[PDB]
Amino acid sequence: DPNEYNEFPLRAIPKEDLENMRTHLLKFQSKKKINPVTDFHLPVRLHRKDTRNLQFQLTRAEIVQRQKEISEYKK
């Protein structure tokens, strides 16, 4: 066939970096456009935690502010 296309190689990722590493798929369920690179306010955290009472838990910004006053109070 004529060279009217673009062909690129496909090589497997080395397995030396796949050990102790898990690659999952994240799916945002919404009708709008969600992009943590620009939409979210950095820094961002993606951890595992209990969802019980997920309405009165201190926001990451709050702990930073509370840490500042705690340091001032202790000093």
- Alpha carbon distance 43, 60 (integer Å): 9
Least distance in angstroms from the C-beta of 64 to another protein: 8
45 binds another protein (CB under 8 A): yes
Give me the 8-37 binding string for another protein, x by CB under 8 A, dash otherwise.
xxxxxxxx--x-xxxxxxxxxxxxxxx-xx
Length of the chain counted residue by residue: 75
Give Cβ neighbours of residue 43 (< 8 Å, ≥ 6 apart).
Answer: 60
Q: Given the complex with another protein, which of 41 and 75 has the nearer CB atom?
A: 41
Residue 52 has which token pair? Answer: 């019980």
73 binds another protein (CB under 8 A): no
75 binds another protein (CB under 8 A): no
**Which residues form the interface with another protein (CB under 8 A)?**
4-15, 18, 20-34, 36-37, 39-63, 65-67, 69-70
